[PDB]
Amino acid sequence: SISSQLSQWNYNNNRVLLKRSILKTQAFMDQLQEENNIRPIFIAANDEREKLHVLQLNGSSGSSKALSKLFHSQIVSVTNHLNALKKRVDDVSSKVFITGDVNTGKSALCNSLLKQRLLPEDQLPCTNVFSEILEARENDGIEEVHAIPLNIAPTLKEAIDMYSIQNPKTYEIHTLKELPDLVPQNGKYALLKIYIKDDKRPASTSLLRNGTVDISLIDSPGLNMDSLQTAEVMSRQEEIDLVIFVVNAENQLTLSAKEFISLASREKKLMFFVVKKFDKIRDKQRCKELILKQIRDLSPETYKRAADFVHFVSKNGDDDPYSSSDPDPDFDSLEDSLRNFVLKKRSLSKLLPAKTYLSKLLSDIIMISKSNMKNLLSIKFFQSLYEGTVAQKLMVEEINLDID
């Protein structure tokens, strides 16, 4: 159809423009890394309103060689993030990350979205290993679990990245119902690839076989369990396009939740907030007000669109209650907003994280440049960098993603 073809043509245009800005911005990062290597860069002391958005420098030239090394590792971190964004902008699929504190109902929500009791769901801490659900066409139609062993690479990210269906040395095969035995084994597995078919449902009601976009769901291990587990959730975030953040109604957004949201918000201006266990709350209106106020503070653009992105969903499994015909307008409304965001609003759902991150990073570089401008060799460098990064930020702000 016309409006579908129009979204595709707009999506391709925006993807071209963002890729171009990513490459230019990486060059500025490379230029800043070389300059700092020969003449360490002055870092100003920032109050809270003027704190940098992406370049996390705990230290300043007034109060803090060791500052130079923190800067270098900051640029490396940003470079890795820009590469991850560039991979995502070029990837046709949409990866959805379902995360939150332990025991908020993450796996129950994934079962809800898949309309079956597939992922282990339990009163006590359960999911210790990233569980990615994909349609089985990627695995030649075969429904099974590929369990990626930690011991195939030095780091979990590297184990994940060397997995190939074509190379059996990178995974163990297991049946779908071995999953309750697999998801606790974070001392053994980096990640579970869970391949399923959904052949009895039409594309209109099938999330994984929707017929226009390849989607995978990643069920996260919980926040606030272990330092290593939290660090892995923090870094998996930048390799995924969309976050669904799951909130326990009794606790609202805890400090561990806010630390994740605040880190993800460097690129994810928009994200879903799904509040579970609201059915248990006695003072429902006071609870709802608390949650909404925290979202306003942590994710103001999500708050403006709260009707599309904030949902209260009590569906859980503790005959299959996830494919039951019983009416559930709360879940139905979440499923509809998710499909609309992912399938129809691709420029926003896929590409807004790239624009948001570039905008904030260019801002930071603009601030550093202004701070480092009147050796005189260094003066000319920061004048060129100021003028170039200013122009690039204006170009990124030109890119209009709200065209669907």
Task: Name the residues that contact ligand GDP, by CB under 6 A.
Answer: 102-108, 121-123, 126-127, 222, 276-277, 279-280, 314, 316-318
- What's the token pair of residue 291? 């949650």
- CA separation, residue 243 to residues 6, 36, 96, 120, 338 (Å): 26, 35, 6, 20, 11
- Residue 316 touches which member of Mg ion, ligand GDP, ligand BEF, none, C-beta under 5-8 Å by kind: ligand GDP
Q: Which residue is nearest to K ion (CB)?
A: 126
**Interaction residues for ligand BEF, span 115-134 (CB under 6 A):** 125-127
**Number of neighbouring beta carbons within 10 Å of residue 170:** 19
Distance CA 294, CA 255 (A): 11
**Interaction residues for ligand BEF, span 86-115 (CB under 6 A):** 102-103, 106-107
Whichever of 106 and 346 has its CB closer to Mg ion, that residue is: 106
Phi, psi for residue 242 in degrees, rounded to 5: -135, 135
CB of 124 to K ion, least distance (A): 6
- What's the token pair of residue 64? 């803090």
CB of 125 to K ion, least distance (A): 5
Tell me the window of 16-24, 63-71, 126-134, 270-278 that interacts with Mg ion (CB under 5 A). Answer: 126-134
CB of 132 to ligand GDP, least distance (A): 15
Interaction of residue 276 with ligand BEF, rule CB under 6 A:
no
* End-to-end C-alpha distance for the chain, whole angstroms: 14
- Residue 136 touches which member of ligand BEF, ligand GDP, Mg ion, none, C-beta under 5-8 Å by kind: none
**Residue 178 DSSP one-character state:** G
> Which residue among 127, 248, 294, 369 contacts Mg ion (CB under 5 A)?
127
Nearest to 235 by CA among 182, 340, 161: 161
Contacts with ligand BEF: how many residues (CB under 6 A)? 8
Distance CA 30, CA 24 (A): 10
Q: Binding string to ligand BEF for residues 199 to 228, with x set by CB under 6 A, is what?
A: -----------------------x------
CB of 324 to ligand BEF, least distance (A): 22
**Residue 109 DSSP one-character state:** H
Whichever of 126 and 129 has its CB closer to K ion, that residue is: 126
Contact in structure between 56 and 102 (CB atoms under 8 Å) = no
Whichever of 102 and 291 has its CB closer to ligand BEF, that residue is: 102
**Within 13 Å, how many C-alpha atoms sit on residue 20's CB side?**
11
- Please return the burial class of 150, using the count of CB atoms within 10 Å of its CB with bins 0-12, 13-18 and 19+: middle
Phi, psi for residue 66 in degrees, rounded to 5: -70, -35
- What's the token pair of residue 378? 């260094």
- What's the token pair of residue 8? 């595709």
Interaction of residue 186 with Mg ion, rule CB under 5 A:
no
CB of 326 to K ion, least distance (A): 24
- Confirm whether residue 104 is marked as ligand binding: yes
**Residue 350 DSSP one-character state:** I
CB of 241 to ligand GDP, least distance (A): 21
167, containing H or E segment: none
- Confirm whether residue 279 is marked as ligand binding: yes
Whichever of 126 and 134 has its CB closer to Mg ion, that residue is: 126
- Confirm whether residue 127 is marked as ligand binding: no
Identify the sign of the CA torsion 282, 283, 289, 291: negative
- Confirm whether residue 107 is marked as ligand binding: yes
Distance CA 110, CA 125 (A): 16
The annotated binding site for GTP is made up of 103-108, 276-279, 314
Sites of contact with ligand BEF (CB under 6 A): 102-103, 106-107, 125-127, 222
The annotated binding site is made up of 103-108, 276-279, 314
Sites of contact with Mg ion (CB under 5 A): 106-107, 126-127
